[PDB]
Each structure stands twice: as structure tokens, then as C-alpha cells.
Design an enzyme around this catalytic site. Structure first.
Site, short mmCIF file in Angstrom:
data_model
loop_
_atom_site.label_atom_id
_atom_site.label_comp_id
_atom_site.label_asym_id
_atom_site.label_seq_id
_atom_site.Cartn_x
_atom_site.Cartn_y
_atom_site.Cartn_z
N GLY A 9 59.19 42.75 24.32
CA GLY A 9 58.64 43.39 25.44
C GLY A 9 59.45 44.51 25.62
N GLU A 27 52.94 47.16 22.76
CA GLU A 27 52.62 48.67 22.98
C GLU A 27 53.81 49.44 22.13
OE1 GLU A 27 54.33 49.82 26.73
OE2 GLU A 27 53.27 51.92 26.56
N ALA A 87 50.07 43.29 27.07
CA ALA A 87 49.61 42.05 27.53
C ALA A 87 48.99 42.40 29.05
CB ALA A 87 50.69 41.07 27.44
N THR A 99 54.23 40.29 27.72
CA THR A 99 54.80 40.28 26.42
C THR A 99 55.91 39.44 26.70
OG1 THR A 99 53.51 42.22 25.74
CG2 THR A 99 55.73 41.34 24.27
N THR A 130 56.88 45.83 38.21
CA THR A 130 55.93 46.35 38.34
C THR A 130 54.51 45.57 38.39
OG1 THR A 130 56.46 46.42 35.86
CG2 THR A 130 56.67 48.32 37.09
N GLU A 174 54.28 38.80 38.60
CA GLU A 174 55.36 38.30 38.04
C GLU A 174 56.03 37.06 38.28
OE1 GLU A 174 58.54 41.00 37.15
OE2 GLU A 174 57.05 42.89 37.24
N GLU A 228 78.18 26.08 19.90
CA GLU A 228 79.43 25.98 20.92
C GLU A 228 79.06 26.36 22.23
OE1 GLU A 228 83.15 27.30 19.24
OE2 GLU A 228 84.42 26.86 20.99
N1 LIG Z 1 66.87 45.39 33.59
C1 LIG Z 1 65.51 45.64 32.84
N2 LIG Z 1 64.60 45.30 33.18
C2 LIG Z 1 63.01 45.59 32.87
C3 LIG Z 1 63.20 46.89 31.94
N3 LIG Z 1 61.86 47.05 31.52
C4 LIG Z 1 61.24 46.46 32.37
N4 LIG Z 1 61.87 45.53 33.01
C5 LIG Z 1 61.45 44.46 33.99
O1 LIG Z 1 60.50 43.57 33.29
C6 LIG Z 1 59.58 43.32 34.15
C7 LIG Z 1 58.36 43.93 33.44
O2 LIG Z 1 58.18 43.13 32.17
P1 LIG Z 1 58.16 44.44 30.73
O3 LIG Z 1 59.25 44.10 29.77
O4 LIG Z 1 58.31 45.69 31.36
O5 LIG Z 1 56.77 43.84 30.30
P2 LIG Z 1 56.32 43.62 28.74
O6 LIG Z 1 57.23 42.77 28.28
O7 LIG Z 1 56.35 44.89 27.98
O8 LIG Z 1 54.98 43.01 28.67
P3 LIG Z 1 53.68 43.85 28.93
O9 LIG Z 1 53.71 45.20 29.44
O10 LIG Z 1 52.79 43.21 30.16
O11 LIG Z 1 52.71 43.56 27.61
C8 LIG Z 1 59.86 43.82 35.39
O12 LIG Z 1 60.31 43.12 36.48
C9 LIG Z 1 60.85 45.20 35.15
O13 LIG Z 1 61.39 45.17 36.39
C10 LIG Z 1 64.42 47.26 31.50
O14 LIG Z 1 64.55 48.22 30.70
N5 LIG Z 1 65.70 46.87 32.05
MG LIG Z 2 54.99 46.54 27.97
#
Ligand SMILES: Nc1nc2c(ncn2[C@@H]2O[C@H](COP(=O)(O)OP(=O)(O)OP(=O)(O)O)[C@@H](O)[C@H]2O)c(=O)[nH]1
Ligand SMILES: [Mg+2]
Ligand SMILES: Nc1ncnc2c1ncn2[C@@H]1O[C@H](COP(=O)(O)OP(=O)(O)CP(=O)(O)O)[C@@H](O)[C@H]1O
Ligand SMILES: Nc1nc2c(ncn2[C@@H]2O[C@H](COP(=O)(O)OP(=O)(O)O)[C@@H](O)[C@H]2O)c(=O)[nH]1
Ligand SMILES: [Ca+2]
Ligand SMILES: [Ca+2]
Ligand SMILES: [Ca+2]
Ligand SMILES: [Mg+2]
Ligand SMILES: [Mg+2]
Lengths: 438, 54, 342, 423
Positions: free
Chosen positions: A10, A71, A99, A145, A179, A183, A254
């Protein structure tokens, strides 16, 4: 030498992985084209850095890493980034549509159609390993995801790699950068399915990183770039023992032996110091005592909680830079006479300490200033259950009304999985309270 | 305090300081779960198409 | 417009505080489960401290210190005094106490009991616990005390020589209200109360030995004879000490009271302080003291959720808003600050 | 490449749809001939969501224009951006629909709907990964209302796993063409309840009151009303058209905005609304964005509770100050947000502002107060239906009175479902 394979799932997992491998190359002296002049054994070798990097005959040092996202836009950044030459296309897996922040869509609907491709690409990396020890899996809790596909991947990894250890780096949701409203659902659904498949998981709350960036780096509105550079520093200090010469946390097993006496309670709290803004021209370098004392401040933890109102099961201090054991023990003695540090009775009150003389590497032009010495504390404290209580409470508010549940049922998930996952988290909160409260 | 297991190398050292002594589902089962969810999606879509046919 | 929630309807102190906040026109009360609050008047049991300080853009404050129960429980206070080097077992202002389970100090209590009976000295002890609402036994036989507990309690030395007010030859205890703000400043309310027994002290009936306001109003025939509600305030008590014993309340008693309050709260400051924490705490405490015939002050009890005297509700609750709430949330001294080194 | 297929049906649907394409073509730098002449790569990064790329680097809107009479579509083809549309995507009949939902849904529209689906299929077949459809139409007429909802049902049958989104103009006696508008709107609302995932409720009553009371237009025209709709449609689609993290596609928007499947009717809002050179600060943008006078549904939000809210800020501004003001409004009026959906307000910021404004804000609310809109339509429906007035226009097209009774009960159920979650 025993290889480790990193898996980034993701958007959060991919972008954090990109920041980590950038930092690894800077730490090991690997150029963006994969070349490593300090490596005198061309095309092979079993050095400590080879646990994370394989070698081609041309001298390219290739990360043992797979990136997976449903994506293509985030992984396309890796394909055309600064370190694009490190990776070959087989390591970068993209789908067509994501997703949609829906655990069930990532786990069942889309996960069923891509899980065999991901495992085949991981198998290609495992076939290059003479003694694979396991996996490091980077993902968010909140994304469809990162939550849904990761839990499916972790289940299949236990089947195909039964003896291998699996560690997690998991991003806990924070509304200041989140986003999706659902969540909390995705976090609890993926924790329930992954709990029996993860040996040790390092949770990072975006809220804590956000405030550390605002307070210590003077960033008014931190972006993912600011957050991931700080996260990659913490991840690097955690994995440094796997990548450099040393005697502490030298293999994935470990980590469980040193930090996880109770298997279900496998979420160590990470605390990092010092975080210093690069905008400051001159900053007074903090001593061993000062950075060690900072490991017991909630303002420096990866998850905001109060370890004074819990109990410790294990504690590791990971130092980087100009640090000698004499000053560590002198700092620990002073700290014990001022801090509320209570261990459980069935564990010894002590610290496993590791020192790497090489000070932390900072990304040129980044937000973090170069420091003479830094430390990451990994403590298995029951106080981290406060994060589960916050998450479970938000779950309970929405699920009492079945809000958004139809999105998950529409993907083929049964409604009973919600309550089954919540019951598991209820048993988890009860475990922490039985261990840490009298 | 007691310092134990001191190990030293060129790149660093490690040790332990003690302050006080103490006082899976199979591949088939996963496949059944994924197929059961797909079957529920197919049933929901069939009911929708039946509703639209009416 | 600041926001607050109320989660303890039975609190008379904070029902008045909540009434005062609304009267300012600058505070708004939310539903008890609305998380977007600035101030939580929390519940007594299982306050969710772990859910505080996680609301972006809201400085959050709660009217209880997490961990302060160590001071505000019978068995917890005894263990805290004995095991803390700041207080130590050589502590002079706390009666000799032992934790007896129905960790256990049965043999230690009997060792000191046998040492007293052998020495022909006063060997009267009192058994009590945190479950005693309006469950207390005073006896000179250790066998009668240990058999009563089996039917977590603490047994401490009963002060056989208390200071007796005249006329009446009667017992009393001093309640002090103490407010600790988010900066861990210790404020002692200038007004205390002497909850007096209306019966003459007989060293040979629990009505003349227990100074509780409920016991005096339910078992004493002289309730309200000497003072209204068996409550004597500091002005009259200080006048009595001058006329009877040629001394003042400040010199003979209050210096020791301020010393004890400071010692107890400084001891637990590292464990409960919210200095660098994501949320902030304050708390109002009720310290209970005994005075012996030689004008020595003894600590008996620390109450974590105390009520107030009827005459002093308005003044004290207003003082709570001033130094504990408005110091964090300013709008548009009745306390003695016990200074200390953090 | 998550493509959206746009459909505009009927007089109202084609007139607001044409203005929508005029506005966003200007935002993306697309000229009336389909040539890009902008100066920012952000204009083209997500251009394929709404535009196909043709020969010579021409950009063609992925838009299908439908009507049962050629009048309005002839005006579109002669309009400012009339030549930008794909000529084969003009699908029209000649009979008209006579402001009659039955003619649009059951007789006249049924004869034309297959040719529209052929064009929809051609556009979908060229999409790398189609994410869904957006439809612009009115509910008070015959073609947009009756044939538009017929189209939605057939699109769902052919594309059951794709998102359906509509901009649906609700009728009002203040701005009315015929007395049968409550009949057409009630019949259409039940269709929307079942067959859309997201519906923006654009109330002609609200549009009129804004033009008259706020914009100081004593005699508002349909053109004046459509200027508010264009600005609103541009704002609510900003997150689909430019890079961003929040609500970047139709499905993630639905997952964030729709906690229960039938309650998917949104109240849109826009700020500023100026009757013009003065700078608007972030506090002013935020307060006006939440004010009922800036809402497009003629419902009082203080009469209900917000289930979910999406806010989009456009222009160069302090995102720190945006976060502070958005938290302020929530913490100031927390009673108007349901407590059983935590953190239900999401905020996006896009650096590119709309034309003529340095800063703007767009509001998308899923509020239980939208039941006032459906109550209003239901009362006007019953006032006529209790006397079976004007029903012969519909029974003459083969409809039975029972279908009206069922549509009446269906919308009263929707009202009762909103009232359930308001308590
Ligand atoms: N620290 C950090 N958090 C992130 C980042 N990108 C997304 N998030 C957090 O991850 C959550 C959203 O999940 P994502 O990883 O963006 O979604 P995904 O895994 O791509 O899944 P879908 O887009 O729904 O298919 C939110 O809480 C965001 O704040 C990042 O680059 N750094
Ligand atoms: Mg995504
Ligand atoms: N060690 C001791 N020596 C002499 N008298 C004592 C004593 N301990 C308690 N007492 C008397 O018994 C009374 C009850 O003691 P205790 O501290 O248990 O009260 P309590 O907890 O029931 C109500 P509160 O919370 O207001 O103190 C005291 O008010 C005091 O008068
Ligand atoms: N806002 C707006 N509403 C319109 C416009 N044209 C018609 N309407 C409204 O739409 C309804 C009439 O339906 P219409 O679209 O003209 O009928 P159709 O061609 O059969 O779909 C009435 O409620 C009108 O008030 C327009 O240009 N703008
Ligand atoms: Ca080599
Ligand atoms: Ca396993
Ligand atoms: Ca015909
Ligand atoms: Mg008590
Ligand atoms: Mg018309």
C-alpha cells in the site's frame, strides 16, 4: 549470513520503504545506480549488508525488497525516482484499482486475484537466499490495501514459509493526516487476522510523528515526506543490527527472544532521541545521559502513552555514534532513581544495550540535523495498550450503529468478522491489563 | 548493577546491564474463505440482476 | 468558548464548579460522551486517561491525577510511606501501620504488639480499610483484630492521647483541602474544618472515638451542641488555642500540616506529574489529620474525591476555577502556596 | 487512469452540463477546440479522468449528451465550447417528453435508451480502468428525470460494480415550469435511492434565494442559477481532477460519505458568493462555507446532524490555518456532528483556485436535515395526488396509480430513515 526480505504494501508501506532504502544506501555507501565502491567482493559475498542487498555480476547492489500496491501511481514514483536503478521491474507490483479504504476489498475481492502474483515475486527473491530468515512487512492500518491485503499476505507467508520469522512496521491511524473515516474498522480487522502470524510488530502512530515534526523540527504542517524521513530513521536504527557487525538483535529470531516473552503481546514501544532541526545553525550536542533520559519522555515515543502507568517486560537501548558502555551505565543508574520504571515480577529489571559507533546518517537537504550520538529505545510496556483502547472505542461507536458496514458486506465479508475481530481485541486489552496492573 | 555478555567489534559493542533479579490455517482453509466471500458477492450480484430483470 | 463534560453527577464540589463555569458565559457543557472537550470532570472509577490528549486543536484538562490513588487508599498509603526513601519507615508524622490481608505483615504487627504488651505500654490499635462507609474495630487484643479482618485491611496504632477540646473533653480531626494544579503547584486552602466529636472521650463506644460527621449525626445525642454540625472552623479553633494553650493554630499545628502535605505530594510527583504529557491534570485532595495532647500532628487519611463544608463550597469552588481551570483556559488569594523544588 | 464517463440528459441536464465543461476546460487549460494552452503540469496530471486524448494532442470530453428533443442540444453545439464535444456523442430524439416522467421512463425514452447505451459502451471500452459515471439532470421534467433514471437503471445492469454519481436539480414552486414537477421528482427520487451511490441535491429554491438575497439579483434567470451550479460542480469534483490524498476517486468518496446505503444525498455549498476584489481570509472562507446561506439544498443544517462532511479549499493559503479553522468550526458546534462517527469531517486543499477567485471553499455535507427537502416534495406530491390531479398525463402513458402510491411510500420511508439517525 542470513538474508531478510522487505515487503512494502500500500501507499504508506511503499513511501516509507522508499525512504528507508534511500537511507540504507546512504548508510552503506551505495550509489543510486547500485554501485558500492567499498565492497571489494564483486558479484557476491556474505557480509552483514548482504542480508538486505544482493549483488549482480556488474556490481549492482539490489535491495531484497518487494513493493505491492493495488494502484500504480505510488509505485510509479519508485520506477522513476532517484533510486530507480536499484530495482528491476519484477520487484514492483501494481494493480489497476485500489481497495478504496476498505479492508474487505483489499483482503477478499482484490487480494484473491493478486496474491499468487505477489507470492511468485517473493519466491523469486527467496530463491536467491542461501539462508532466508524471514520478512519485514511495512503497511498502514487504515488503508484498504495496507490492512486487507497485508493480512492475506501474512496468512499465506505462514503457509509457504512456516519456519520464517515475520516482523511488522505498522502505521497507526491519526485523524490529522488520515484519509478515511473507517480506518478504525480496518485497523482492528487487520490486527485480528495478522495477530497469530506476526512475531514482532513496531507500531508508529502518525499523531506522534506529526507532533515531533511540529515541535522538534519546527514544521508548521508536516507532509508525508517529513513524516517518512523521521520514520525511516527509527526503522534504520531498529534494523541496523541486521545490517552491520554486532552481537545484539543479529537475527529476526532475536527480536522475539529479546522483546516478546508473551507471543500475543508483541508490540514494542519505540522511543527516539534526539530529533534536532537542521535549520538551527548551531545546536548543543546532547550527552549520553540526556538522550537516554529522553527515552522516558512521552513526547519522544512513536505512540503517545504513559509507561509510568504500566509495566515493562523487556527493554533494549540501541545507540548510534560516540557512545561507550561506561556512560550508558552511568546514565541508567541516574535514570532509575528518578523515573517510574516497573518491570513485571517474572522478568529481570535490566536493559540490553547495543552500540554502533557510526553516528546516524541524515538525508542531505532533509529536516533532521546531524548529531554526534542518538538512541532508539525498544521497550515492551503494557502502556501501549492505550492505543488499542483508543482504537477499540472508535470502533465501538461506529459499529453500534453498523455505520459503513454495508461496504464490507458488499465485498463478500460476513458481518460476524467485525464482532469476531472486536472480541479478539477485547481479549488483547484484557491481557495487557492482567500483565501491567495490580 | 551488573554488566554481562560484553561483546566488542570494530563497528561497536553490546552488553546487558541488570539492575534487579526477577521476583495456523492451511492453504486449503484460506482458499475456502476467499471462495466463500466470492460466492457471497456472486449471490448479491445475481439478486441485483434479478431485481433489475423484474 | 471553552467546552467541558461532566462524568460524576454525585460530586457536590464539581456540580458547583460546573455551575460556576456556565455562569461565566464563556463555558459550554457538552454531552458526557462528546470527545471534543477542553475540560473533563471525570468519574471516580476507571477514568479513561488513555483517551485524553488525542484531539487535534484541543488543550485537554482533567480534574484527577492518574496514579494519585497510591496516596488515597488505606493499604496503598501505608506501603507508599514504608517503601519510599523520601518518607521512610522512620517517618515521624504517620502512625505505625501494617497491611494485613484477610506483602502481608501479620507477623510484623504481632511482633510489635507482643513488644508493647511486654513493655507495659499502650497497646491499642485500630483496624480499618477503604471499604468502610459509615467497618472499623478498635481493640487492645491483637487476636480480636486479626479475627475481624478474616470475617485488604490495615491496622495502625490508635492515638490513645488525643488533644481534647474543652468544654466537652472531646475528640476531633482536622480536614485540609489541597489543590494541585497542572504545574504541580500545591495550594492549601486557608479554610479548614475541625470535625468534632460531641461526646466526651472515654478511654475505657465508637461515637466518642470516631469523629465522622455521619457517626456523630446518627449515634451522638449531643450533635450540634457545642458547634453547628459538629464542625469548628479555624477562626474559633485558633481563638481556643490562644485562650487555652497560649499558642496559635499556625505555630502549633499548621506548620506540621504544611510539612506533611508537601512531603506526600512531592514524593509522588515523578509518578503522576503531567508536565510533559499530552494532556494535563489537576486534583483536589482532602487531608485528614489528628492532633495529640502534645500538639503533634499525625496524618490519618488522604481523600481523592472529598466533599466540602457547606459554608466553604462557594469560596473553594471559585478558587478551583481561578487557579486550576482559568490558568489553562483564561476568561475575558484564598490559597497558601506550599512552595517546593520540582 | 481512473476514467469517469459523464452523461447529461434533458434541458436542465445539458445546460448545466455544458457550463460544467466550460468551467473545468478553462481550469485545465483546454480551449474550445480541444487544444491545451496552460502553464502548469497540475492541469494535465489527472486530465484523463474527464478527457480522452485524440490525434494531435486534442483533449475530448468523455461526455454523452442526451435529449428527447434537439432544441437545447442544438444550442449546446452552437455554444462557446460546443465544438469540443465528440459529435457521435450527441444522442437525441425529436418527440420530446412533455415534462412527463412516464414519457421519459416508459415510452419516448425507451425508444432512445439503447442508442445512448451504445455510446456509453464505446466510451467505457476505451477506458483503461473506468471508475464510474456522473449524470447531470433535473428531477422536475421528463427527459432528465424519467429517461435519466431509466439510463441509470440500465447502466447499473451493464456495469454493476461501478460507481453511479448524479447532480440532481430538485424542483421548487419558486422556479417552476409545470405543476407536475412534484410527481416527476417523487418518481425519480426512489430511482436515485436504489441506483446511485452519491447524489448532489441541487435545490432550485436555494439557487433562487442565493441569487436574490445574497447576490442581489432581483430577477434571477436560469443562467444566473447555472452559474452557482457550475461553481459548485467544479468545487465538488476538484478532488477527482487534481492530485490529492482525500476522496481522490468516486469510490473512496462514497466510502467516506455514505454510512448507510440509502442515505447518500448530499448538501453542497460554496464560498465566496459575492454580488468582488476584496481578499477573503481563511476564517471567512470557513465560516461562510458552513453557513446555511451558502448551501444549495434549501435545508437548515441546524435542524439536523452531520453524518459526514467533505471540505475542499482552493487557492494558495496556509494549510496550518485551514486545519485550525476546520477544527474550530467542529469544536465550536460539536452538537451538530453525530458522535457515533468519529472524525467525520475531512478536508482537502488544492493549490489551483477557480477562475476569478484567489481563494474558494466547497462544502459537501451528508446531513439528516436533507429530509426537509424530501418532506417538501412529499407534501406537494400529496396535495395533488389526494385528488388524483393531473394523473391522466401519466395513466395515458400506461402507468397505474399504484406506482404513484408506492413512490409516495418510498420517499416517506426515506424521510423516516433520516429522522432515525437524527435522534
Ligand atoms: N506515515 C505515513 N502514513 C501514511 C503514508 N501514506 C498513507 N499513510 C497513512 O495510511 C493510512 C491510509 O492508508 P494507505 O496506505 O494510504 O492506503 P493503501 O494501503 O494504499 O490502501 P488503499 O488506497 O485503500 O487501496 C492513513 O492513515 C494515512 O495517514 C505515508 O507515506 N507515511
Ligand atoms: Mg492506496
Ligand atoms: N490511628 C488513629 N488514631 C486515633 N484515631 C483514629 C485513627 N484512625 C482513625 N481514627 C479516628 O477514626 C475516624 C475514621 O478514620 P478513617 O480515616 O477510616 O475515616 P474514613 O476513611 O472512614 C472517612 P474520611 O475519608 O473523611 O476520612 C477518624 O476520623 C479518626 O477520628
Ligand atoms: N437550475 C436549472 N434548472 C433548470 C434549468 N432548466 C430547467 N430547470 C428545471 O428543471 C425542471 C424542468 O425540467 P427540464 O430539464 O426542463 O425537462 P427535461 O428536458 O424533460 O429534462 C424544472 O424544475 C426547472 O426549474 C436550468 O437551466 N437550470
Ligand atoms: Ca560483495
Ligand atoms: Ca508462524
Ligand atoms: Ca416512436
Ligand atoms: Mg476515606
Ligand atoms: Mg424545460
Amino acid at each position: 549470513m542470513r538474508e531478510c526480505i522487505s515487503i512494502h504494501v500500500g501507499q504508506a508501506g511503499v513511501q516509507i520503504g522508499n525512504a528507508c532504502w534511500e537511507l540504507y544506501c546512504l548508510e552503506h555507501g551505495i550509489q543510486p545506480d547500485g554501485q558500492m565502491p567499498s565492497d571489494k567482493t564483486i558479484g557476491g559475498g556474505d557480509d552483514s549488508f548482504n542480508t538486505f542487498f544482493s549483488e549482480t555480476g556488474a556490481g549492482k547492489h539490489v535491495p531484497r525488497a518487494v513493493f505491492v500496491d493495488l494502484e500504480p501511481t505510488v509505485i510509479d514514483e519508485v520506477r522513476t525516482g532517484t533510486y530507480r536503478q536499484l530495482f528491476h521491474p519484477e520487484q514492483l507490483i501494481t494493480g489497476k484499482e485500489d481497495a478504496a479504504n476498505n479492508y474487505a476489498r483489499g483482503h477478499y475481492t482484490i487480494g484473491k486475484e493478486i496474491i499468487d502474483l505477489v507470492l511468485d515475486r517473493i519466491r523469486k527473491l527467496a530463491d536467491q537466499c542461501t539462508g532466508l530468515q524471514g520478512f519485514l512487512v511495512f503497511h498502514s492500518f487504515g488503508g484498504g490495501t495496507g490492512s486487507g491485503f497485508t493480512s492475506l499476505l501474512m496468512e499465506r507467508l505462514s503457509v509457504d514459509y512456516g519456519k520464517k520469522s515475520k516482523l511488522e512496521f505498522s502505521i497507526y491511524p491519526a485523524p490529522q493526516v488520515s484519509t478515511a473515516v473507517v480506518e478504525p474498522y480496518n485497523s482492528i480487522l487487520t490486527t485480528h487476522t495478522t495477530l497469530e502470524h506476526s512475531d514482532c510488530a513496531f507500531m508508529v502512530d502518525n499523531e506522534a510523528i506529526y507532533d515531533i515534526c511540529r515541535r522538534n523540527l519546527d514544521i508548521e504542517r508536516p507532509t508525508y515526506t517529513n513524516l517518512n524521513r523521521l520514520i525511516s530513521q527509527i526503522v534504520s536504527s531498529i534494523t541496523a543490527s541486521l545490517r552491520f557487525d554486532g552481537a545484539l538483535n543479529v537475527d529476526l529470531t532475536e527480536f522475539q527472544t529479546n522483546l516478546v516473552p508473551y507471543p500475543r503481546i508483541h508490540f514494542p514501544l519505540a522511543t527516539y532521541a534526539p530529533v534536532i532541526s537542521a535549520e538551527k545553525a548551531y545546536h548543543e550536542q546532547l550527552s549520553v545521559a540526556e538522550i537516554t533520559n529522553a527515552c522516558f519522555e512521552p513526547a519522544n515515543q512513536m505512540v503517545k502513552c504513559d509507561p509510568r502507568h504500566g509495566k515493562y517486560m523487556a527493554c533494549c537501548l540501541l545507540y548510534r555514534g560516540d557512545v561507550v558502555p561506561k556512560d550508558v551505565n552511568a546514565a541508567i543508574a541516574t535514570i532509575k532513581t528518578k523515573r517510574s520504571i516497573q518491570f513485571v515480577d517474572w522478568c529481570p529489571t535490566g536493559f540490553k544495550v547495543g552500540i554502533n559507533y557510526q553516528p546516524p546518517t541524515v538525508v542531505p537537504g532533509g529536516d533532521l540535523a546531524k548529531v554526534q550520538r542518538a538512541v532508539c529505545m525498544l521497550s515492551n510496556t503494557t502502556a501501549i495498550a492505550e492505543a488499542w483502547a483508543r482504537l477499540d472505542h472508535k470502533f465501538d461507536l461506529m459499529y453500534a450503529k453498523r455505520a459503513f458496514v454495508h461496504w464490507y458486506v458488499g465485498e463478500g465479508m460476513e458481518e460476524g468478522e467485525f464482532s469476531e475481530a472486536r472480541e479478539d481485541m477485547a481479549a488483547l486489552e484484557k491481557d495487557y491489563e492482567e500483565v501491567g496492573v495490580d | 548493577m551488573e554488566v554481562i555478555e560484553l561483546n566488542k567489534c570494530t563497528s561497536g559493542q553490546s552488553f546487558e546491564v541488570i539492575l534487579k533479579p526477577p521476583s495456523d490455517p492451511s492453504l486449503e482453509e484460506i482458499q475456502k474463505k476467499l471462495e466463500a466471500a466470492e460466492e457471497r458477492r456472486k449471490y448479491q450480484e445475481a439478486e441485483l440482476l434479478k431485481h433489475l430483470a423484474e | 468558548m471553552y467546552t467541558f463534560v461532566v462524568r460524576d453527577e454525585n460530586s457536590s464540589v464539581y456540580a458547583e464548579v460546573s455551575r460556576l463555569l456556565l455562569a461565566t458565559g464563556q463555558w459550554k457543557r457538552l454531552r458526557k460522551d462528546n470527545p471534543r472537550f477542553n475540560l473533563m470532570l471525570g468519574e471516580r472509577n476507571r477514568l479513561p486517561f488513555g483517551r485524553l490528549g488525542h484531539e487535534p486543536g484541543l488543550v485537554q484538562l482533567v480534574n484527577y491525577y492518574r496514579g494519585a490513588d497510591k496516596l488515597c487508599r488505606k493499604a496503598s498509603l501505608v506501603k507508599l510511606i514504608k517503601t519510599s526513601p523520601e518518607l521512610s519507615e522512620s517517618c515521624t508524622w504517620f502512625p505505625e501501620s501494617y497491611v494485613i490481608y484477610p506483602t502481608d505483615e501479620r507477623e510484623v504487627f504481632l511482633a510489635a504488639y507482643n513488644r508493647r504488651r511486654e513493655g507495659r505500654e499502650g497497646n491499642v490499635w485500630i483496624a480499618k480499610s477503604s471499604a468502610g462507609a459509615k467497618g472499623i474495630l478498635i481493640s487492645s487484643e491483637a487476636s480480636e483484630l486479626l479475627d475481624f479482618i478474616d470475617e485488604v485491611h490495615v491496622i495502625q496504632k490508635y492515638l490513645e492521647k488525643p488533644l481534647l477540646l474543652e468544654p466537652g473533653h472531646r475528640k476531633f480531626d482536622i480536614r485540609s483541602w489541597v489543590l494541585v494544579d497542572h504545574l504541580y503547584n500545591i495550594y492549601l486552602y486557608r479554610e479548614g474544618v475541625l470535625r468534632t466529636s460531641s461526646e466526651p472521650y472515654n478511654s475505657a463506644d465508637k461515637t466518642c472515638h470516631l469523629t465522622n460527621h455521619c457517626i456523630q449525626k446518627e449515634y451522638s445525642k449531643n450533635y450540634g451542641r457545642y458547634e453547628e454540625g459538629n464542625e469548628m472552623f479555624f477562626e474559633e479553633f485558633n481563638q481556643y488555642l490562644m485562650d487555652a494553650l497560649n499558642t496559635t493554630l499556625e505555630n502549633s499545628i499548621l506548620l506540621q500540616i504544611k510539612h506533611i502535605i508537601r512531603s506526600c505530594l512531592m514524593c509522588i510527583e515523578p509518578a503522576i506529574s503531567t508536565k510533559h504529557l499530552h494532556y494535563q491534570s489537576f486534583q483536589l485532595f482532602g487531608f485528614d489529620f489528628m492532633v495529640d495532647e502534645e500538639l503533634k500532628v499525625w496524618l490519618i487519611e488522604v481523600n481523592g474525591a472529598p466533599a466540602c463544608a457547606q459554608k466553604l463550597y462557594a469560596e473553594l469552588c471559585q478558587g478551583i476555577v481561578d487557579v486550576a481551570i482559568s490558568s489553562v483556559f483564561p476568561l475575558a488569594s484564598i490559597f497558601i502556596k506550599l512552595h517546593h523544588h520540582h | 487512469m481512473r476514467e469517469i464517463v459523464h452523461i447529461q440528459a434533458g434541458q436542465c441536464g445539458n445546460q448545466i452540463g455544458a457550463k460544467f465543461w466550460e468551467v473545468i476546460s478553462d481550469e485545465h487549460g483546454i480551449d474550445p477546440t480541444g487544444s491545451y494552452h496552460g502553464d502548469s503540469d497540475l492541469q494535465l496530471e489527472r486530465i484523463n479522468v474527464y478527457y480522452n486524448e485524440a490525434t494531435g494532442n486534442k483533449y475530448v470530453p468523455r461526455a454523452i449528451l442526451v435529449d428527447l428533443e434537439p432544441g437545447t442540444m442544438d444550442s449546446v453545439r452552437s455554444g462557446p465550447f460546443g465544438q469540443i464535444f465528440r459529435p457521435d456523442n450527441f444522442v437525441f430524439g425529436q418527440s420530446g417528453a412533455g415534462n412527463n416522467w412516464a414519457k421519459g421512463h416508459y415510452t419516448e425514452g425507451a425508444e432512445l435508451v439503447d442508442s445512448v447505451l451504445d455510446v456509453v459502451r464505446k466510451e467505457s471500452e476505451s477506458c483503461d480502468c473506468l471508475q464510474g459515471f456522473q449524470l447531470t439532470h433535473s428531477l422536475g421534467g421528463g427527459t432528465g428525470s424519467g429517461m435519466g433514471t431509466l439510463l441509470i437503471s440500465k447502466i447499473r445492469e451493464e456495469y454493476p460494480d461501478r460507481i453511479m454519481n448524479t447532480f440532481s436539480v430538485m424542483p421548487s414552486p419558486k422556479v417552476s415550469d409545470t405543476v407536475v414537477e412534484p410527481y416527476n421528482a417523487t418518481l425519480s427520487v426512489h430511482q436515485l435511492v436504489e441506483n446511485t451511490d452519491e447524489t448532489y441535491c441541487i435545490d432550485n429554491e436555494a439557487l433562487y434565494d442565493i441569487c436574490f438575497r445574497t447576490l442581489k439579483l432581483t430577477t434571477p434567470t436560469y443562467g444566473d442559477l447555472n452559474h452557482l451550479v457550475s461553481a459548485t460542480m467544479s468545487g465538488v469534483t476538484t478532488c477527482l481532477r487534481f492530485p490529492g490524498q482525500l476522496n481522490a476517486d468516486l469510490r473512496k468518496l462514497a466510502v467516506n460519505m455514505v454510512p448507510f446505503p440509502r442515505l447518500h444525498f448530499f448538501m453542497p455549498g460554496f464560498a465566496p458568493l459575492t454580488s468582488q476584489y476584496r481578499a477573503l481570509t481563511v476564517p471567512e472562507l470557513t465560516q461562510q462555507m458552513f453557513d446555511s446561506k451558502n448551501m444549495m439544498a434549501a435545508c437548515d443544517p441546524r435542524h439536523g446532524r452531520y453524518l459526514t462532511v467533505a471540505a475542499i479549499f482552493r487557492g494558495r493559503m496556509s494549510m496550518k490555518e485551514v486545519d485550525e479553522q476546520m477544527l474550530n468550526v467542529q469544536n465550536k458546534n460539536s452538537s451538530y456532528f453525530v458522535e457515533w462517527i468519529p472524525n467525520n469531517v475531512k478536508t482537502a486543499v488544492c493549490d489551483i483556485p477557480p477562475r476569478g477567485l484567489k481563494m474558494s471553499a466547497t462544502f459537501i455535507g451528508n446531513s439528516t436535515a436533507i429530509q426537509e427537502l424530501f418532506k417538501r416534495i412529499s407534501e406537494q406530491f400529496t396535495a395533488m395526488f389526494r385528488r388524483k390531479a393531473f394523473l391522466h398525463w401519466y395513466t395515458g402513458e400506461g402507468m397505474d396509480e399504484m406506482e404513484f402510491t408506492e413512490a409516495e411510500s418510498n420517499m416517506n420511508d426515506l424521510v423516516s430513515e433520516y429522522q432515525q439517525y437524527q435522534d
